[PDB]
Paper text:
In a systematic effort to identify regions of the protein that could be amenable to crystallization, we produced a construct of [name] spanning residues 1–463, that was highly overexpressed and soluble in recombinant form. Inspection of the 2.2 Å structure revealed that a large segment of the protein construct, spanning residues 239–330, was not visible in the electron density map, presumably because of conformational disorder. Consequently, a new TimN construct was prepared carrying an internal deletion of residues 239–330, that crystallized more readily and yielded crystals diffracting to a higher resolution of 1.85 Å. Removal of residues 239–330 did not cause structural alterations in either the TimN crystal structure, or the solution shape of the [name]–Tipin complex; small-angle X-ray scattering analysis showed a small but significant decrease in hydrodynamic radius for the complex missing [name] residues 239–330, indicating that these amino acids are disordered in solution. The N-terminal domain of [name] is an α-helical protein with an overall shape that is reminiscent of a horseshoe. Although it is not possible to assign TimN to one of the well-known classes of helical-repeat proteins such as the HEAT or ARM repeat families, TimN does contain six two-helix hairpins, with the N-terminal four hairpins containing an additional helix in the intervening segment between the first and the second helix of the hairpin. Surprisingly, TimN forms a dimer in solution and in the crystal; however, SEC multi-angle laser scattering (SEC-MALLS) experiments showed that full-length [name] exists as a monomer in solution. The peculiar shape of the TimN structure suggests that its concave surface might act as a site of protein–protein interactions.
Human [name] is involved in replication fork stabilization, S-phase checkpoint activation and establishment of sister chromatid cohesion. In the cell, [name] forms a constitutive heterodimeric complex with Tipin. Human [name] is a large, multi-domain protein of 1208 amino acids. During DNA replication, the [name]–Tipin complex is part of a larger functional assembly known as the replication pausing (or protection) complex (RPC) that includes Claspin and AND-1 (Mrc1 and Ctf4 in budding yeast, respectively).
Author numbering: 7 to 173, 183 to 238, 333 to 454
Amino acid sequence: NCELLATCSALGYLEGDTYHKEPDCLESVKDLIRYLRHEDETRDVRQQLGAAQILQSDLLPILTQHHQDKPLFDAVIRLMVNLTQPALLCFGNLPKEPSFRHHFLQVLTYLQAYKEAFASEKAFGVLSETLYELLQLGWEERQEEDNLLIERILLLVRNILHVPADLASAHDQLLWAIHLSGLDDLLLFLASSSAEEQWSLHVLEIVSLMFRDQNPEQLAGVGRSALNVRLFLRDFCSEFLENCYNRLMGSVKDHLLREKAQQHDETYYMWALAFFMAFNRAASFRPGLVSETLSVRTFHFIEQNLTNYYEMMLTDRKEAASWARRMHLALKAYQELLATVNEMD
């Protein structure tokens, strides 16, 4: 706290449009990570750093201007991933007391501010360049530090798109920065590549969050975001269906079935099935582009999930509202299957 404020002033400063580090910068960044790992139940550390606007005043300048210092750039990414964590995941559940509730809402206020700071083509430019380079390396020729940095970049993009909650202009600005930086092309590459199946859950979360404000029939152009953002999303969705959906949805489902222990969030799969099958159908694309989720096996899988959610809503009563939300996403996916099959007669 006094330690915390001394560490923050030992990062650097901006002389005009230029950021000057201090020689103990990498050290200070890592100290801030240690503080965040020892914070109380108030999440005081991330609240203090949020109040101080360290992410904006220091970390983003370091990221954009000093990205050739490899250990420091990696340290800053780690810190930003932790600082951009969804507020639900920081406090666990929603505070009912007027105390923790003021905290939760302060954490969320800082998340919303980080989301607007990231509205910048140079931030995403640096992330996309770095990701591009990391992926040029063959899959079995890059080190665990390389895969670990891929993972953190994807988690950071995920977290920034997630703000403020689970499944207007700020998100739109992020989408445009994703488009202008080329990160859109890296996401499509990752989705369509058998060799990058380890990243498929991360990529599906990012793609689903990119489309969160959108209506699939409207986007398909047979009847909110600015027109040039909607056109970019239409183009992205078209390419995604043409080249990526079957592969990505097949790999996600594989992870979901093989890694039950990890309690992956399978709501992104349910959300994506309903959105992208609705778009494919509205656009009159060929059925083959959604064949992976248009099958008896998919009916069975959605039915299994809907049964499980419904049973949990009735037995895990302390979380009944969360299970009801999951049940609603599964049901919407089932309705889209039924609507698609019913138009095949």
